[PDB]
Amino acid sequence: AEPYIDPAAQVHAIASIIGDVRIAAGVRVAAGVSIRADEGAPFQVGKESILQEGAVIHGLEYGRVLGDDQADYSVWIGQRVAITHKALIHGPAYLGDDCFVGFRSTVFNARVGAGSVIMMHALVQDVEIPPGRYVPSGAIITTQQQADRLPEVRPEDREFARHII
Amino acid sequence: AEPYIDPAAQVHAIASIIGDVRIAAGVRVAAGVSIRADEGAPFQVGKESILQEGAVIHGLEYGRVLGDDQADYSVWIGQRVAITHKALIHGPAYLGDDCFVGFRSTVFNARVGAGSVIMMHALVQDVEIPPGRYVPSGAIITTQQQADRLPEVRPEDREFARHII
Amino acid sequence: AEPYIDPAAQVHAIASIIGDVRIAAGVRVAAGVSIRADEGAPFQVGKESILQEGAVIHGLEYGRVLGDDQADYSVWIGQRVAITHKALIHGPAYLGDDCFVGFRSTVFNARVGAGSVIMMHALVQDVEIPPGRYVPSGAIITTQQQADRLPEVRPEDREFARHII
Amino acid sequence: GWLAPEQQQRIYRGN
Amino acid sequence: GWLAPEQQQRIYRGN
Amino acid sequence: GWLAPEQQQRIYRGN
Ligand SMILES: [Cl-]
Ligand code: NI
Ligand code: NI
Ligand code: NI
């Protein structure tokens, strides 16, 4: 009913975290981030994840994903996930460890495998993205055929991601 | 000069409604919604409409649409219209009854016929969308030829919409 | 370390300007605008520029553009630049005088020549746009080949821009 | 406005 | 939901 | 940065 905020998390005073949200050690949450597990709950934000300004995490009343701990979440964000400016993560949603979600991108009703890089102005909806795939800027990914076809993440993509965080 | 808020509306304490805005019975307005009829005015939000977080309703100083009541509005939102996360409705704008505007979608200088479903990450600008049309995710609808060509809404589309509200 | 705000600027009480930001005479900043030179700094907003609601100006810790004054900025916004609803300007970024950035558009790691018109729902990343080019609605401009190919701004485009400001 | 009058009329009123 | 059950299962759990 | 130096220079300075 109230958020669990790890004493080692750095949550900006002006961030809004509401409801059954677990924020792990080393998570950074910028000003003007909204995390509301007031409809869909619970949410998990894994260790050393980063949420930038304008990021929203919300969830549908119904529909869940299976967490790494074998519990059900509206939203599971793994470790060292980067949710950048103006990204929307809408449950049901799974982001595996080391994922990057670029500016103004959306993940809704989707599972994104670890080590995937979603670029800027993209939509990921209704799909499982396999681990380690790249979603180009402006992509609209709404079918499993499209998600199974995505190219692999290259080292240049992760270096790009590390620069932006 | 000040908003008329129906006693049966549910407006979040942190929503910002400014200027000549009429909010009808049963309208729900989330936290972090901005409705400013401070340039373009007036705005009408019809019965049992829903505005989700990040939604903005603004309007140009000049340019109007004809309301169902035969009065001129910067923004006319009909009954049971769903304006979802991060949608922008910019006057001049008409949304007919039972319309759905998906995540991060924009309606600007446009008339959207009743019972239309606008999906996620779409733009609707400078057009009349006939009643009961579907605008796919990622569509950029900026010409009347494009708007006259849109496919019809199917029952699966409205069921999708009801799930998201 | 603190913003320089020209006494002739009109900054809304609810706008958030943080860090090494210079706001020139006649700049208008709407409510719910965020300018944070807390990572990448400094920022310059030139005379009679307009920032509308939802606009964000941020910058990477590293990477700069050369200002007209021959100093280095994370973000240089020239004179009479229009940064409209929900636009993201992310340093390193240069916007030349008289540029227009339409609703929900992004400029990141890019130089936009004076008198350019960026329309709605567009991305401009990693490029130099020559002076006086038009970026259509929904464009994803991420390569120099694409930016060198853009069409010229016509008078109808600037008239459109003046209407929206 | 910026559109042809007959097109602005489809937005103002509709067919 | 709105998807085929086997597709909602790829999102719930993954292969 | 992530770009070729001559391309980052077009962004830093322009032609
Ligand atoms: Cl947005
Ligand atoms: Ni929601
Ligand atoms: Ni406006
Ligand atoms: Ni940033």
Numbering used by the authors:
A (entry chain A), B (entry chain A), C (entry chain A): 16 to 180
D (entry chain B), E (entry chain B), F (entry chain B): 256 to 270
What does the paper say about this structure?
The full-length CcmM protein in Synechococcus elongatus PCC 7942 (Se7942) is a homotrimer of ~58-kDa subunits (SeM58). The N terminus of each M58 protomer consists of a γ-class carbonic anhydrase-like (γCAL) domain that has lost the functional motifs for CA activity, followed by three Rubisco small subunit-like (SSUL) modules connected by flexible linkers. The γCAL domains mediate M58 trimer formation.
To identify the C2 binding site on γCAL, we analyzed the γCAL198–C217 complex by X-ray crystallography. We also solved the structure of γCAL181 in complex with the C217 peptide of CcaA at a resolution of 1.63 Å. The peptide is bound as a two-turn α-helix (residues PEQQQRIY) in a pocket beneath the protruding β10-β11 loop, making extensive interactions with residues in β11, β17, the β19-β20 loop and α1 of the γCAL protomer. The hydrophobic interactions include π-stacking between the indole ring of residue W257 in the C2 peptide with the benzene ring of F123 (β17) in γCAL. In addition, the hydrophobic residue Y267 of C2 contacts the γCAL residue L81 (β11). Notably, the binding site of C2 is highly conserved in the γCA/γCAL domains of CcmM proteins.
